């Protein structure tokens, strides 16, 4: 039963074969969730499920550099459900982040920030009850 927003340090940055697992429950009437992999003030990977963008559900992914957002990558497959428990897994691969939700592959995000060892914090925010956030090496 962790506090949101939650900041999870990633000691020494991310590395290929690192697996991050987030367990929680989506609040009723949730509007948004966000995972922010941070390199200092920059956001290397922003993963942003939106439950009502013009009455559509969409996942927006982006990178923020020098306080400016880049080109969005959008995914219309939406596995989250208001009120229900979820599992997000982020596997770091050499050329992308690989995201699975409830054990089903969802998307890959090509690395725009290439100093992977400097991506050393994960922020978790939005309309969820957070149960656990951890990492391991596979």
| Site for ligand J1E, residues 20 to 59, rule: CB under 6 A | 32-34, 46, 48
Tell whether residue 63 is a contact of ligand J1E (CB under 6 A): no
List Cβ neighbours of 55 (8 Å cut-off, separation of 6 or more).
Answer: none
CB of 73 to ligand J1E, least distance (A): 8
Tell whether residue 75 is a contact of ligand J1E (CB under 6 A): no
CB of 118 to ligand J1E, least distance (A): 21
Report how far apart, in Å, the C-alpha atoms of 102 and of each of 5, 66, 80, 118, 132 are: 22, 34, 9, 28, 14
Residue 106's nearest CA partner among 119, 94, 92, 89 is 89
| Site for ligand J1E, residues 80 to 109, rule: CB under 6 A | none
CB 101 within 8 A of CB 107: no
Which residues here bind ligand J1E, judged by CB under 6 A?
Answer: 32-34, 46, 48, 60, 62, 69, 72, 74, 125-126
């Amino acid at each position: 039963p962790l506090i949101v927003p939650y900041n999870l340090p990633l000691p020494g940055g991310v590395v290929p074969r690192m697996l991050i697992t987030i367990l929680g429950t989506v609040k009723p009437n949730a509007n948004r969730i966000a995972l922010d992999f941070q390199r200092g003030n920059d956001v290397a990977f922003h993963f942003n499920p939106r439950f009502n963008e013009n009455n559509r559900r969409v996942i927006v992914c982006n990178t923020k550099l020098d306080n400016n957002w880049g080109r969005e990558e959008r995914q219309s497959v939406f596995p989250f459900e208001s009120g229900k428990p979820f599992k997000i897994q982020v596997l770091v691969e050499p050329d992308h982040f690989k995201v699975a939700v409830n054990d089903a592959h969802l998307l890959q995000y090509n690395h725009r920030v290439k100093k992977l060892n400097e991506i050393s914090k994960l922020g978790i925010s939005g309309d969820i009850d957070l149960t656990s956030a951890s990492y391991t090496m596979i």
